[PDB]
Symmetry: C3
Subunit: 404 residues, 3 copies
């Protein structure tokens, strides 16, 4: 723990004062592979640790639960993200980012995006080669197969024969072995988190960061201080009502938060998030369902970033942002949040479609050269949103746990 | 059984009178994903269910079964297919389709087709990375690896050490744990089958079907009544002679036919064709070899299709059918029946080579004017031809089971 | 074994005399499958045999060993390679291949090869999706995951709960079943190895071989009499020094030296080399490590091929080869040896980059007009070179194990 915190501070404040000194492209040839090494070795775990812990997590009460508890949190995930965009727009009207007239014109970003198929992405939730999907990544058709297997072995320990139930105990206990084998490594990769972390911010400061000034200084304030409010106004209040101690939650989830802010992957944070929930006394049927579906649908941090930026660009050109009917951001930023992907960046590239709905496309060359000011400093605002993106799952995971 | 017939007859009558009204592209975005939701769930099962029932399929008598019964089933397959094409000819010689001059000229199909290397597919029958080949569909190199491991485990249960035989007895009972667990899901997807087999056949009557008139009407009868003879002349005359009852047969095999007729996917209908054989007291060492090979090599209904169509297209111009030297269609159609793929569509697109053989290519852009009208009602003849394709499997899979 | 020799002698001698009668493109479309059918069946095994024997090999003493060894073997590999290239020079300095002055000019090879990323390959040593790496070949990140597994099960067989270890033991024991079952086939594929051997070198004599004369005949000496030395000089001299009887070593490693010479794949040999290593009685947690890492780092044979050919080209035109300052071959070629792949061809295509170090690039249309003579007999020097590449692995695997 302490080596991570001592590594994180002196890391950024080593890499910050090399950025003002023109060593951006030397902190690349030195510091930014060790941060990948930390990344790779978290990504290596993700596939077995989700599959084993989810064939085991269908051994507990099979109907309801994985469909009554699963619907509990479905109500939670939409309301949390729904409120997060209300917070971030009110923060962009308590602040005012965009008083300087958008400087450069030219160099337009993309334009002919196509999406969604919509129907043939809901059907792509159900796999065909259970072995293929499981071999690509695919952290959501892999879940669906695991639960439908785990139920099938529950009913198989009920049949009259012994050699029926005597091969099913073999199977399921063997798969349980890997489950234990995969939490077992996940702290032996934690291991090297101090030096991993020291690297990761040492870079993301020299290349972008020694950069923040002006109205980009005003907007970074409205991102972080808007994000602060989500932690202590929505979580420390909903944990406080639902029995659980506020501080005992954050004393335990500290090791998953740090590997979310520093890493910016929600997806490659997930084995260490899965362990932290076993550390605080959660039964498998809940957490190894609500965390993998959670790190792809509950995007609380992204909803505030997507709300506050679809307002910085309205101010930067001078659009009146609809006096009353700006709630058409409130529907779109939720529908973008659930859309938004795991790996870093993709929170902003889906910010494209929430600008599109209220009425400013990136075809217009002076809208999307002023989008180039924000996309210049994206990774900085990604560290922040990713922390809330991943803590918002864990908050609901234990608040649905102590209900059913 | 009942809601499948209730759903089938009122599926094919509801969509039928929506297809004389131009709602072809409307059933498209309403009743077409519901038929696919049923297909995807079935194709999900095909991959472990063939692997698990195959490691245990070489649990019982090792050579001579997969050895002398692996020769019996072969002789059965080449002869049921060759009788079938001849039965299609004297159907196109009792009915006569192709009177009028094939109307338009232009818009011709693909014309340079390469393959087969032949030598370089028979070597392709033996895999290199079993873990990937099994992750890539591949229901014929995956069968080779699954037998060859089962022989190995039989020989290890013979070793004198009790940590040689005490580690085999885990692996082999664990794989059986899936084989049981897989057949358990194979009815859980058959639950939704009425709504799946209301949605599929509702579509194949909206687009296409409300199209069968004129010359195509005369050939559609000469396909379906040719498909009737194979049932009550080759199955119901050979099932009768070999002990087993012909009426106890359709009492059991009417759970894979209904699926096969409607899906039109032989390889996507194998998991439930694998089960209805365990339902009627067929031992493992037979049915997990004689069906996966049967669902790609015994194409009984296609031989009759490629038989009758390689005669409609000769009639549509007027070529004299070779009045004495027409027995070279019969060799190509068998060598095309064995060639023809698992999934839908690939029968008529294989017809390319049996037309080519006798004289008339599809490069000639007046042959391709009449092929375009057959390929305009392919999906209707696709339903019937598939049912005899996978009935001729279950026919042999029970007759050869009662001899060895 | 006697059938490999009776198949090998009149194997080459049968293929040879047909080559003087222009059946080059006739022995291609008749004999060369059966060689490949032997290759495919061996390459079938490489995947499970290197995965299983390597999880269980991490079950044996965990720190040091896989940490003290693998520091032992590593150094031995470097000093064998570095010796062999210097054995290579003083064989081409001992002969002198290259009096003929390059005949024509033209018909150039590739020229630009990009790579090395250099660091983004030492990072791709650690996998992401274990289930695909494994399903892709990849026998070095697959090594890395497996060692990291057995080390997790060791601790897991050390837990105080009889479900924490009563499940973990079941896992390791089913993985053990496959392990044993994979070796069990590796002589049942070593079965048809006399028709395997005869077909293979039947080809390699018809299309190439009937070419060797001139200074090609001269160089074909220095290469073969160089490789002869490395064994009865660095092995029969390091086996004698380290206990282990020489003549017993070559008695046992017979059925992996013939499978290596005839295949010319270091990768495609290994399952039946791993087995010979189990035969002489080496420990799991040694050979399951040292032969995987060895089939791609230790290339004693290619170290000699390269050294002698970076020298044929120099004489071919008539440069000095730098009078003393030539050991800039020795650093590069060992850096090139460790680079060189496991499948055939890769040696001479790497020989490029070492020639590029002494200052004769392949772009030069009279430089690589001599290089297209040496590629024209490369499958012939491949066989000799491959035998030493795999012998040098087994020699070290042995010496190292009798130390620790
Ligand atoms: N980095 C975010 C995704 C995003 O909004 O870009 C996450 O991992 O949750
Ligand atoms: N749809 C057919 C294949 C074909 O087109 O002939 C089947 O499943 O058997
Ligand atoms: N064929 C060689 C590699 C090479 O040098 O080309 C081997 O298998 O070791
Ligand atoms: Hg689960
Ligand atoms: Hg089988
Ligand atoms: Hg190992
Ligand atoms: Na998302
Ligand atoms: Na999230
Ligand atoms: Na068939
Ligand atoms: Na076929
Ligand atoms: Na080697
Ligand atoms: Na090498």
């Amino acid at each position: 723990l302490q080596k991570i915190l001592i590594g994180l501070i002196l890391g950024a404040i080593v890499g910050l004062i090399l950025g003002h000194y023109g060593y951006a492209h030397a902190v690349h040839t030195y510091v930014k592979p060790f941060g990948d090494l930390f990344v790779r070795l978290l990504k290596m775990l993700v596939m077995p640790i989700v599959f084993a812990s989810c064939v085991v997590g269908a051994a507990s009460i099979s109907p309801a639960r994985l469909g009554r508890v699963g619907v509990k949190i479905v109500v939670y995930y939409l309301l949390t993200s729904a409120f997060a965009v209300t917070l971030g727009i009110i923060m962009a009207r308590l602040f005012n980012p965009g008083a300087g007239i958008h400087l450069a014109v030219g160099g337009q970003q993309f334009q002919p995006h196509q999406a969604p198929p919509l129907v043939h992405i809901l059907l792509d939730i159900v796999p065909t080669n259970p072995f293929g999907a499981l071999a690509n990544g695919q952290v959501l058709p892999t879940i669906f197969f695991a639960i439908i297997l785990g139920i099938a072995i529950t009913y198989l320990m009920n049949s009259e024969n012994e050699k029926v139930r005597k091969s099913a105990e073999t199977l399921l206990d063997a798969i349980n072995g890997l489950a234990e084998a995969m939490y077992k490594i996940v702290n032996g990769v934690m291991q090297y988190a101090p030096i991993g972390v020291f690297a990761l911010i040492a870079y993301v400061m020299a290349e972008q960061g020694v950069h923040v000034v002006g109205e980009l200084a005003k907007v970074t304030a409205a991102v972080y201080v808007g994000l602060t409010l989500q932690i202590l106004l929505v979580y420390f209040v909903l944990l406080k009502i639902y029995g659980i101690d506020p501080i005992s939650f954050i004393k335990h989830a500290k090791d998953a938060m740090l590997t979310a802010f520093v890493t910016r992957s929600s997806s490659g944070t997930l084995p260490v998030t899965m362990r932290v929930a076993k550390e605080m006394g959660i039964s498998e049927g809940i957490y190894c369902f609500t965390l993998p579906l959670g790190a792809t649908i509950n995007m609380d941090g992204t909803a505030l970033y997507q709300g506050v930026a679809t307002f910085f660009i309205a101010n930067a050109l001078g659009s009146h942002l609809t006096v009353g009917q700006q709630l058409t951001i409130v529907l779109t930023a939720v529908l973008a949040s659930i859309g938004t992907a795991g790996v870093p960046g993709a929170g902003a590239i889906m910010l494209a479609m929430v600008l599109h709905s209220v009425g400013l496309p990136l075809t217009d060359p002076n809208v999307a050269a002023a989008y180039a000011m924000i996309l210049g400093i994206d990774a900085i605002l990604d560290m922040g949103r990713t922390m809330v993106n991943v803590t918002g799952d864990l908050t609901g995971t234990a608040i649905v746990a102590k209900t059913e």
